[PDB]
């Protein structure tokens with residue numbers, strides 16, 4: 585097929601500074617940083633992911649770098665560059681509000697119907713881009729959707745992309761290990777359910793092994809209290825046995841966009857209209873020198 589002409593940018597360790605730790609798990613550690621290129625008079629807020637040094641782990645992080653550098657879309661997280669230190673590290677765009685899952689849980693009392701429906705459009709938009717690029721995500725969840733600003737979200741975590749989370753997986757993905765663009769549609773359905781429930785855990789209490797039988801019996805995730813039958817019908821359509829019967833991401837963009845025009849007709853939230861989330865309208869919305877700071881989305885070299 586088509587040659588992948590993507591540019592892999594190698595960055596100097598001296599060009600960036602680690603400020604604080606954002607998340608440290610089994611993978612290694614993710615830091616909040618600032619990237620000050622050569623003499624460009626700019627400060628780019630970054631997220632640096634560093635890994636001991638084992639040849640097996642280094643191969644895995646370089647494959648994630650391959651996928652991340654191959655994508656480019658307003659609703660998909662891109663790799664800015666890599667630094668070849670003794671350990672090796674990925675330089676990514678800082679998403680100050682973290683993952684959408686923690687965001688909906690922590691801000692439920694101020695998340696209105698407009699935001700929820702706009703996020704659905706945005707996720708479908710990124711997922712439709714991944715489809716056009718012939719790339720299957722294989723791990724779409726509210727935990728893998730990051731928040732740049734409350735009004736702008738992007739899809740991330742390409743550790744399993746390709747050109748186990750059972751409770752987000754499609755039927756063919758569990759029983760036959762079949763991963764298609766339509767199997768990501770099932771994962772999108774669970775993602776939307778997570779949002780509409782304000783970060784509630786899918787199939788809570790139920791073990792992962794029983795899921796296979798439950799889905800074959802016809803049991804699916806319940807209707808969230810805020811959901812009208814209009815929004816729930818879409819979630820249900822994402823969970824059909826026949827993958828071709830499930831909606832396409834371009835249809836999902838259209839469907840949620842129609843709903844985003846009159847959000848109170850499709851999502852019933854007590855306190856809607858009087859709710860508000862941070863925005864560039866806020867006084868001091870944006871530690872050391874914040875003079876010379878620009879986002880990665882605006883910093884582009886020819």
Ligand SMILES: Cc1nc2cnc(Nc3ccnc(N4CCC(S(C)(=O)=O)CC4)n3)cc2n1C(C)C
Nearest residue numbers: 606607614631661676677678679680682683740741
């Ligand atoms: C709490 C928090 N604050 C963040 C700010 N900015 C990013 N930036 C980005 C940009 C692109 N991708 C990513 N992800 C890539 C995959 C990783 S990992 C280390 O789990 O592989 C998680 C974040 N983060 C990630 C952030 N986090 C994550 C640890 C969830």
